[PDB]
Design an enzyme around this catalytic site. Sequence first.
Site, short mmCIF file in Angstrom:
data_model
loop_
_atom_site.label_atom_id
_atom_site.label_comp_id
_atom_site.label_asym_id
_atom_site.label_seq_id
_atom_site.Cartn_x
_atom_site.Cartn_y
_atom_site.Cartn_z
N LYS D 10 0.98 -1.22 -0.11
CA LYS D 10 -0.29 -0.43 0.13
C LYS D 10 0.73 0.68 0.12
O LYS D 10 2.15 1.53 -0.59
CB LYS D 10 -1.30 -0.17 0.86
CG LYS D 10 -2.06 -0.93 1.43
CD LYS D 10 -2.97 -1.36 1.99
CE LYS D 10 -3.80 -2.17 2.40
NZ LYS D 10 -5.02 -1.96 3.30
N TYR D 50 -12.86 -2.17 -2.92
CA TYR D 50 -13.76 -2.00 -1.62
C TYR D 50 -14.81 -1.96 -1.13
O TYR D 50 -15.15 -1.89 -0.47
CB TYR D 50 -12.81 -0.26 -0.67
CG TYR D 50 -10.86 -0.90 -0.55
CD1 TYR D 50 -10.70 -1.66 0.11
CD2 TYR D 50 -10.52 0.45 -1.30
CE1 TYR D 50 -9.59 -2.01 0.94
CE2 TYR D 50 -8.93 0.32 -0.16
CZ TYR D 50 -8.35 -0.47 -0.02
OH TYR D 50 -6.94 -1.34 1.19
N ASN D 113 -1.39 -0.01 7.39
CA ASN D 113 -1.45 -1.63 7.50
C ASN D 113 -0.60 -1.58 6.34
O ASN D 113 -1.26 -3.00 6.62
CB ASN D 113 -2.40 -2.32 8.31
CG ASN D 113 -3.86 -2.36 7.26
OD1 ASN D 113 -3.54 -1.71 6.36
ND2 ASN D 113 -4.74 -3.42 7.21
N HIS D 116 -1.88 -5.91 1.54
CA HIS D 116 -3.77 -5.91 1.40
C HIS D 116 -2.97 -7.59 1.06
O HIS D 116 -1.81 -7.60 0.46
CB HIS D 116 -4.64 -5.37 0.71
CG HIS D 116 -5.64 -5.12 0.59
ND1 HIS D 116 -6.43 -5.78 0.84
CD2 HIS D 116 -5.32 -6.72 -0.90
CE1 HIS D 116 -7.49 -7.28 0.30
NE2 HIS D 116 -6.72 -7.19 -0.55
N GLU D 129 -9.73 -10.50 -7.13
CA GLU D 129 -8.61 -9.11 -7.19
C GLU D 129 -7.93 -9.58 -7.96
O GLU D 129 -8.16 -8.13 -8.59
CB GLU D 129 -8.29 -9.27 -5.45
CG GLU D 129 -9.65 -8.83 -4.16
CD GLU D 129 -8.91 -8.97 -3.12
OE1 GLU D 129 -8.09 -9.65 -2.71
OE2 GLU D 129 -10.24 -8.46 -2.18
N1 CDP Z 1 -12.23 -0.08 11.13
C1 CDP Z 1 -11.24 0.00 9.74
C2 CDP Z 1 -11.46 -1.09 9.08
C3 CDP Z 1 -10.82 -1.70 8.05
N2 CDP Z 1 -9.48 -0.42 7.79
C4 CDP Z 1 -8.89 -0.31 6.88
O1 CDP Z 1 -9.46 -1.25 5.14
C5 CDP Z 1 -8.75 -2.10 4.99
C6 CDP Z 1 -9.94 -3.23 4.74
O2 CDP Z 1 -10.63 -4.27 5.54
P1 CDP Z 1 -11.22 -5.02 5.98
O3 CDP Z 1 -11.53 -5.60 6.81
O4 CDP Z 1 -11.59 -6.11 3.82
O5 CDP Z 1 -9.08 -5.53 5.69
P2 CDP Z 1 -8.29 -6.92 4.87
O6 CDP Z 1 -8.98 -7.57 4.47
O7 CDP Z 1 -7.50 -6.50 4.75
O8 CDP Z 1 -8.02 -8.29 6.59
C7 CDP Z 1 -8.08 -2.63 6.01
O9 CDP Z 1 -6.58 -2.97 5.50
C8 CDP Z 1 -7.64 -1.26 6.51
O10 CDP Z 1 -6.48 -0.37 6.38
C9 CDP Z 1 -10.06 1.04 8.61
O11 CDP Z 1 -9.39 1.61 7.54
N3 CDP Z 1 -10.77 0.76 9.51
#
Ligand code: CDP
Lengths: 151, 152, 151, 153, 153, 152
Positions: D10, D50, D113, D116, D129
């Site tokens: 990222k 997203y 983080n 991804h 994806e």
């Molecule tokens: N409360 C949250 C949850 C997720 N996120 C961000 O959005 C991304 C996507 O959410 P996700 O549940 O699909 O996370 P991952 O699929 O990357 O594990 C995350 O990698 C977080 O960076 C956030 O900014 N705030």
Amino acid sequence: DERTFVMVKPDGVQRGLIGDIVTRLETKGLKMVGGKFMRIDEELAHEHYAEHEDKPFFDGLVSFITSGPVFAMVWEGADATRQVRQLMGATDAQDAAPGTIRGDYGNDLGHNLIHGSDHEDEGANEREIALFFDDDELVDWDRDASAWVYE
Amino acid sequence: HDERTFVMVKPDGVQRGLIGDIVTRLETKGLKMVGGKFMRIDEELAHEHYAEHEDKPFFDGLVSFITSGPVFAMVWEGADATRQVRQLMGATDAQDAAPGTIRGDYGNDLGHNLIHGSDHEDEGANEREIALFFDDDELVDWDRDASAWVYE
Amino acid sequence: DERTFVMVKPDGVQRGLIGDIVTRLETKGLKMVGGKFMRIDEELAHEHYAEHEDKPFFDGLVSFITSGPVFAMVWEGADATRQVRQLMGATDAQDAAPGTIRGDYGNDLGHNLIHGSDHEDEGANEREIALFFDDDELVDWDRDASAWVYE
Amino acid sequence: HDERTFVMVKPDGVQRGLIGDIVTRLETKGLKMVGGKFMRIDEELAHEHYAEHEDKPFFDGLVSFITSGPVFAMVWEGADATRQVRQLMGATDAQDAAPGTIRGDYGNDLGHNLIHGSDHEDEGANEREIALFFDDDELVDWDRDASAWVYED
Amino acid sequence: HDERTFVMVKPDGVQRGLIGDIVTRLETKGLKMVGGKFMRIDEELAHEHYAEHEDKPFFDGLVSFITSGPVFAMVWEGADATRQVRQLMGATDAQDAAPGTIRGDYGNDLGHNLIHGSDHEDEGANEREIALFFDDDELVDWDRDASAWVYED
Amino acid sequence: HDERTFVMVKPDGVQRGLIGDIVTRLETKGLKMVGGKFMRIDEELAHEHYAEHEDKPFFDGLVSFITSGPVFAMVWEGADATRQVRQLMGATDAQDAAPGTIRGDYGNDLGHNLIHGSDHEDEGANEREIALFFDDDELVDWDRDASAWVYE
Ligand SMILES: Nc1ccn([C@@H]2O[C@H](COP(=O)(O)OP(=O)(O)O)[C@@H](O)[C@H]2O)c(=O)n1
Ligand SMILES: Nc1ccn([C@@H]2O[C@H](COP(=O)(O)OP(=O)(O)O)[C@@H](O)[C@H]2O)c(=O)n1
Ligand SMILES: Nc1ccn([C@@H]2O[C@H](COP(=O)(O)OP(=O)(O)O)[C@@H](O)[C@H]2O)c(=O)n1
Ligand SMILES: Nc1ccn([C@@H]2O[C@H](COP(=O)(O)OP(=O)(O)O)[C@@H](O)[C@H]2O)c(=O)n1
Ligand SMILES: Nc1ccn([C@@H]2O[C@H](COP(=O)(O)OP(=O)(O)O)[C@@H](O)[C@H]2O)c(=O)n1
Ligand SMILES: Nc1ccn([C@@H]2O[C@H](COP(=O)(O)OP(=O)(O)O)[C@@H](O)[C@H]2O)c(=O)n1
Ligand SMILES: [Mg+2]
Ligand SMILES: [Mg+2]
Ligand SMILES: [Mg+2]
Ligand SMILES: [Mg+2]
């Protein structure tokens, strides 16, 4: 003190991971007392994996362990047996946690890089060390840095 | 002025050549150094640092260890910093610290366990240990620009 | 034995290279005796770079060295001064060889990561160490591993 | 396996100079790069990537972040890759990730983080994806000869 | 600078799992990735890339090698990049390269020397090699904010 | 059956935790391990290894060093291997070895200089040192498949 047989399997050797594995165990403070690049013959393999002689994976196990050279070792330190299985991570490298040897470098069960005596099997460490190494090949020394690793 | 934690490479960490390796995991993690001092802990200072263990069997040997060679005393700043540091260091007893943590990777003892960091679960341990080892003239108030990429 | 003033410049600090630099000098076997995270004020800078007071780059030099915190150090070991300039590589990081600190991490002259007393300038090491550190801040100890680094 | 997953450094990982560490991690694990592109993500592409999140409060903050700088997009292949990669990354919230994982060594933020990786517990996320980021002409079919030592079959 | 150079992990570097180390090396040096593509090189593209060598005896061996597996193609940018990258790589013959360089740590062959980088002493090689591998739509224009600490101006 | 060189982590290399780091530079470089033995050198073996320096002042202290703790004795195979190893190790005197080499990175002494590798410039030093420290039953004849990618 406690020693344990540890060996870099033929995948490890072929993948050029002997250094990295040795470094992990030196950096944890442990003491190498035996170290030998060798090939395992089929009689040594059969005797090593004896406990698995009935299992469906045996012939593939001996086939693999005998498929190229290994780097056989003995390591000594406090609680060494168990400390080493903790470094290695889980037997199936696909399940090992990141930061362990198999978590970082493998994802296979058969080609899982490395072997370390199982501390839950009492006497496995001494029996495997005596399998691979004669008393003449094991070295008694004082690693001075042990005075800072241990109280 | 965000969360600060006190962290110390113990004399064994210093003897074994591990100062930079520890410092590198703290900065790589994104935390900011705001204090940093290579020093010897005298016996009074260690009585005060370890006052809570004065009754316990291991106290005398703990004070003798922590004064038995120089230390690298640090203060680290960043979001949830106390607790992030406790997780990077892993279990107090290094024979139980998980591989990937500083103690699981580098140690095989409980007394000689490389480093100390304030316990986030003891309320105000950070502020107190920081204040014990550092005067406010040796903490440095700065902006680490890559902070703009570490956090949202 | 011989000590030398070594400092991670504000680019190094900002770029999170203190650990890596410290590790390079510990791994070469050298002994840290002084270590301090601090900010250089303009009177300390002026006194440090005094030799460059007439040069066209001076004001930019003090401006930079004063632009964020540094990590100031003293190191001791055999031939330490010169050993350290060898680690650092050439002053202009664009000219430093790979495997040195500046060869790996910089390519600028001003923002060249680090400073080390110049061994060709006799007495530069003692004069800079006394500039940055009081005798109370420098630690006399025995690094046990010195018995294996040196005969 | 032909099991492939989509993986993205990222904009924070890119800015902090960590493209290489993340790649070494994946290579060292024995996984095979089959796709890889340094690239900028724009509005449409993030909104689709997203969109499962279109109704969420962090959504606008997220498209803004994932669009605020370049990313290194990738595809990796190997046994159970999608799952292995997910374990290598650690918890989505870096401040929760275990030391040893990408997130636990390098991040302590949820928004930023580092990285991804397709969710193995969401069936189709990987293949979806990947087809999002890559045309099939940009993926490579090759044989990492070291695979014969990473795997027995 | 806008000074850009073309850099390629060759099929050997790719097969030996060294994409990440080479990238960390370049990032750590403070250089900015602006292009990057995992890709296969075919006949036409190699014959043009190497054509300065069309009359040479190692030429056929070379197109065969550079076409025998995928490569990681790249563009990097920064002060004096083309030259800095060339020094980072070491001598073209790895067995001659100094330890500390990519070639001196990882190769000891001339054919399989890990990596390629535009020759700063050949004027136009960088801009020519880049336009060879990359359309201008595949290069990114961004600001590595750490640049302000790598450089004073 | 390609070019082999003998290489030895000296007792200081072993004491300081550097066996794996050295081994890692040899394999990362693409060279193949064919022998490898952790052992103590006895005094006769060191008289023979260092016979050429028997007249020289530093001999006695050299034999005492090389017997003063265990060593890791190795044989390494690969194209131009003797000389490649001498270049990875750098100058015999580590205070002059170039940064990037094993001695420039890890050492600050000439006696305690981490490792030995056969001198390619002394004709037949490799074959002789190998034969001195290893029986032909402890050399391993194998194919390292990634050789197919290291060389043309
Ligand atoms: N409360 C949250 C949850 C997720 N996120 C961000 O959005 C991304 C996507 O959410 P996700 O549940 O699909 O996370 P991952 O699929 O990357 O594990 C995350 O990698 C977080 O960076 C956030 O900014 N705030
Ligand atoms: N289904 C299985 C089980 C074990 N094995 C291999 O045989 C070895 C010895 O099995 P083991 O149960 O003693 O496991 P560890 O003591 O090595 O943890 C393992 O390391 C596996 O590599 C296998 O290839 N397939
Ligand atoms: N039996 C024990 C228990 C703790 N200790 C040491 O004393 C230190 C402080 O104990 P502690 O429970 O407050 O641990 P931390 O706050 O450092 O996690 C530990 O780091 C141990 O090194 C010891 O030496 N012997
Ligand atoms: N033209 C120049 C020369 C020196 N300098 C800086 O001023 C510092 C001190 O210069 P110096 O000649 O004492 O070099 P060193 O002793 O640090 O090798 C250097 O490290 C350069 O960073 C500069 O910014 N521009
Ligand atoms: N005698 C030679 C010379 C070069 N080569 C290869 O062909 C490539 C291009 O030659 P070059 O002189 O343009 O080398 P560089 O521009 O990569 O430094 C090298 O990287 C070598 O891999 C070869 O195989 N045999
Ligand atoms: N004055 C000297 C010279 C050499 N030596 C040691 O003896 C070893 C053999 O000397 P040598 O010139 O044959 O060097 P190499 O063949 O190992 O490069 C060196 O590695 C030095 O450690 C020494 O201890 N004192
Ligand atoms: Mg078992
Ligand atoms: Mg407590
Ligand atoms: Mg000067
Ligand atoms: Mg000689």
